[PDB]
Design a protein around this ligand. Structure first.
Ligand SMILES: [Mg+2]
Ligand SMILES: [Mg+2]
Ligand SMILES: [Mg+2]
Ligand SMILES: [Mg+2]
Ligand SMILES: [Mg+2]
Ligand SMILES: [Mg+2]
Ligand SMILES: [Mg+2]
Ligand SMILES: [Mg+2]
Ligand SMILES: [Mg+2]
Ligand SMILES: [Mg+2]
Ligand SMILES: [Mg+2]
Lengths: 206, 117, 155, 60
RNA sequence: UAAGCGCGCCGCCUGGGGAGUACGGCCGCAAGGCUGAAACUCAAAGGAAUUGACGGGGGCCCGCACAAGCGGUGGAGCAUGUGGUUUAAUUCGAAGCAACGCGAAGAACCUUACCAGGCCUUGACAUGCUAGGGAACCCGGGUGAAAGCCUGGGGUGCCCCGCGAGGGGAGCCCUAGCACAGGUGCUGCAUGGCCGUCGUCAGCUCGUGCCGUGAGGUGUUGGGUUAAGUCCCGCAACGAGCGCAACCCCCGCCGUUAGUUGCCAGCGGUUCGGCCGGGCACUCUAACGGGACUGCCCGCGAAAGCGGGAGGAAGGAGGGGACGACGUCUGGUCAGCAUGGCCCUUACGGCCUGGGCGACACACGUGCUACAAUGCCCACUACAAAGCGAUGCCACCCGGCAACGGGGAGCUAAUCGCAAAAAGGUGGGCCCAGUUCGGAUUGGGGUCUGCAACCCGACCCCUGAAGCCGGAAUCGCUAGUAAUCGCGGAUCAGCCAUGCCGCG
């Protein structure tokens, strides 16, 4: 029981909110709830698209949602039919009118959430974990990270004895607060239960 | 450097000291960017780690060894005293003279005798 | 503690007599940070030293303190099975501290009902070489000496 | 008793008193902060992701 | 002075145990010696070196570890959690430190997982298929403790054949059937996630080189120094990484920006409270900056550093946070959530009314209030900070001894409110007493919340328990700390908060 959330630890400094609206005591409750049914819906529908973030701004009580995906192709559709329904789905579940923008994650191999998702997906499909891990870290570093770490939880290869295979390269100065360590976490659901996957990508300083 | 314009005080303290010991230990050893073609050692027993390394890379070892030393691990010996400043200078100097002559451009004997004891 | 000797706290002098020794003593009279009460108790008490003698309280105060300081104390040291109370010197600092504490501790054993009287009379008695503070101090040199046999462990 | 208890919490019944806070992701009934509509676990989990807008690790 | 290289000759070994035993034989005065098996049994016994861990081994070194102190706990009442007992049930988990005012940041019903009893079943909730009806919605009638069961009515916007008959129709809702839901039922050694803990301890590693048959070692053994594997020196190592530190927040000094709801120094006016003009200077507020670095001086030292000094608001990490390495603990949690597997299906699911989690012969933990005179009561008078509030904070009247109730401004709050800060100071009362100490217990009469305070709420108003400082033991704290005094908040209708997190 230790190591605090490398995002939570940064926030004001180095790394920004995933939702930036204001609301007073009477309001926050309901907009936060929305935010959440929003993220939740997009979290499962845009799985194939490899989504890293779901940033949510909110102004004249109107809602813009930026979805930072690796595969905008997938969220869009051929000529944008899929993103049609997506804009209508959100509107169905929120009593409101919601801008849904896409944004290509330029390099998906520096997106901790994606790197993490990829390894998780690999595991879900009976891939060797140690290798999967080690490779993920090679990909991250090749893509110019100053350092990267990846951690698969336990029940690797299906064992009775749960474990925790880690693997890392470069600097990952978690105590350093100017660092800019993206962090990411996906599940592997398996016949044999869940393994969790943590990726840390270190990108630079100041 | 106009980067030194900036940089914390901690970097100044740390970087100056660092250079200083680099400067200290690597002054000679920087002029060669390649395994030498021979090493020339004064006390080869005193400097046996160095002899060991060359011996291991098939680098010739030349030395000014005296009665203390194991000549069998020296390829070209100058059997002679290796403790008198006077003795070394004699042999270090004539040895270098030989080098310059043979590289082209014979010279004067340099400062050596600073205050010979 | 382990690393170093520890700095002794310089007390701020007294606001009347300007003596650092008076604020020490006041700080011993003080209970739960109620320092006003304390210094108010010490000064009343100084006025009781007027009413019951044309002597300055400071002079008499300083004299009580000097007669309650101990010379030597048994300090517990251990062999490794049974334990010996060993006699040895007392620091200047420790002396002062012991003296003021006993003084206060002694003063509050007393049977009079106001504190200021208790502290005054106990000051008077101690400068006259015999209060309950002085017994404590005596008891402590009669604890050394009762154990002068073991003075060859002086730690 | 959980799924049907997160449900019976939403319907609002005889006597105003019978209604209770109940966390909005967790069904948790205890340690739900009325500002967020969240359990104290829920609130920590989100807070760290930067999904509670404005909310920061505090330190003084 | 070989365990090297060789020749001669002797002696001895052939897995461990059984066993130097048995049998036999020889020797011995005896004790016993020598010679010396097998059955059976085990899958090893074992040498040396390696990394650890351990020591009632050593050296060096640290932490409120002891010591020095100051105040407590252990005794008393009570509050609270726990063991246990009990119960129909007293749901469940937490178990040395690191379980026990812990999950619980709010148990009368709700919560609620338990008990009793009354009720429901495609279900309180989801996705979808078939079908006569109904197809939104909304109202009462019986029977009930309530759920529920039975009931009878008001009454179709919508797509659309249409100028209509009449007729297609999608939401949506009930009836039955099908898939399915539901499970706080089990497993924290099947798990994730999160947490505790050793420990903010000073460590844990790597790349290449070098050493070793090898595990591994060096680096990271040594000397100095530091809060620190911090730094220096040294050295078959030269570097690097995770940690340390720094980058982040608060507090301390100052500057710039800004001047209302905040401030009021000098004016001018004045129903006194900055109330009006003025003004932002100071105080504040809050955003950006400056500022400390052993930088300077003296001494010691090879250096790192140390002792001291000056200046400075501030030094030698200025004071506090946030922050927890590789790993440990088969630690904690399937009852926050998620999750593999196991199990329940007119019930282990679901709804209700009532009870229970509040039981009490005991035991324990954490607390509160105390035993009093450095005190207690009453009057009067001050000086905070951080928070909170428009179905809420409530000024101010009035009635009431009072809780509170009637009125009723202001406040989307640097505006108005909670708000009295308490300890302190000034008066007075008590006069050492189980008391004007202490406020347990119990009787009555009230108030408020709420459908409802019997089990079981808090508050107000008119009995007065134990307790005269606590055994063995045991805890906390190194400075604005302990000690003491109040204030606020989350949860929350209310509150069993004396808890918690904060503020001074
Ligand atoms: Mg409630
Ligand atoms: Mg025989
Ligand atoms: Mg002690
Ligand atoms: Mg007690
Ligand atoms: Mg259980
Ligand atoms: Mg476990
Ligand atoms: Mg358990
Ligand atoms: Mg276990
Ligand atoms: Mg309970
Ligand atoms: Mg009695
Ligand atoms: Mg008494």
């Amino acid at each position: 029981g230790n190591k605090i959330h490398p995002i939570g630890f940064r926030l004001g400094i180095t790394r920004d909110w995933e939702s930036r609206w204001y609301a007073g005591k009477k309001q926050y409750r309901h907009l936060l709830l929305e935010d959440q049914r929003i993220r939740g819906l997009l979290e499962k529908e845009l799985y194939s698209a490899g989504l890293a973030r779901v940033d949510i701004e909110r102004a004249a009580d109107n809602v813009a949602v930026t979805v930072h995906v690796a595969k905008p192709g997938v969220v869009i559709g051929r000529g944008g039919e899929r993103i049609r329904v997506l804009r209508e789905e959100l509107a169905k579940l929120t009593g409101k009118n919601v801008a849904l923008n896409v944004q290509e994650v330029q390099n998906p191999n520096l997106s901790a959430p994606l790197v993490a998702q990829r390894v998780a997906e690999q595991i879900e499909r009976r891939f060797a974990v140690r290798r999967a891990i080690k490779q993920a870290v090679q990909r991250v570093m090749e893509s110019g990270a100053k350092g990267a770490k990846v951690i698969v939880s336990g029940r690797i290869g299906g064992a009775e004895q749960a474990r925790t295979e880690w693997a890392a390269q470069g600097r990952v100065p978690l105590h350093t607060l100017r660092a800019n360590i993206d962090y990411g976490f996906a599940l592997a659901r398996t016949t044999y239960g869940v393994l969790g996957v943590k990726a840390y990508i270190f990108l630079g300083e100041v | 450097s106009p980067e030194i314009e900036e940089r914390p005080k901690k970097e100044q303290v740390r970087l100056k000291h660092e250079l200083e010991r680099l400067q200290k230990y690597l002054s000679g050893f920087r002029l060669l960017k390649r395994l030498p073609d021979a090493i020339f050692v004064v006390d080869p027993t005193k400097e046996a780690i160095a002899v060991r390394e060359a011996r291991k890379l098939f680098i010739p070892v030349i030395a000014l060894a005296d009665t203390d030393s194991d000549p069998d691990l020296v390829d070209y010996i100058i059997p002679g005293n290796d403790d008198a400043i006077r003795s070394i200078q004699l042999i270090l100097s004539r040895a270098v003279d030989l080098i310059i002559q043979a590289r082209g451009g014979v010279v004067e004997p340099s400062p050596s005798y600073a205050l010979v004891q | 503690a382990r690393r170093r000797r520890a700095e002794v706290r310089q007390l701020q002098p007294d606001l009347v007599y300007g003596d650092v020794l008076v604020t020490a003593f006041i700080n011993k009279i003080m209970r739960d940070g109620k320092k006003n009460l304390a210094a108010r108790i010490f000064y009343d008490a100084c006025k009781i030293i007027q009413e019951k003698t044309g002597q300055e309280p400071l002079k008499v105060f300083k004299q009580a303190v000097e007669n309650v300081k101990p010379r030597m104390e048994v300090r517990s040291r251990r062999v490794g099975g049974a334990n010996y109370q060993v006699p040895m010197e007392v620091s200047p600092r420790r002396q002062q501290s012991l003296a003021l504490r006993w003084l206060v501790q002694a003063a509050n054993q007393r049977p009079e009902r106001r504190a200021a009287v208790r502290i005054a009379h106990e000051l008077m008695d101690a400068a006259e070489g015999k209060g309950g503070a002085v017994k404590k101090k005596e008891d402590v040199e009669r604890m050394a000496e009762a154990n002068r046999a073991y003075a060859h462990y002086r730690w | 008793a959980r799924k049907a208890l997160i449900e019976k919490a939403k319907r609002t019944p005889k006597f105003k008193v019978r209604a209770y806070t109940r966390c909005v992701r967790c069904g948790r009934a205890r340690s739900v902060y009325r500002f967020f509509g969240l359990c104290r676990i829920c609130l920590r989990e989100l807070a760290h992701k930067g999904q509670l807008p404005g909310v920061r690790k505090a330190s003084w």
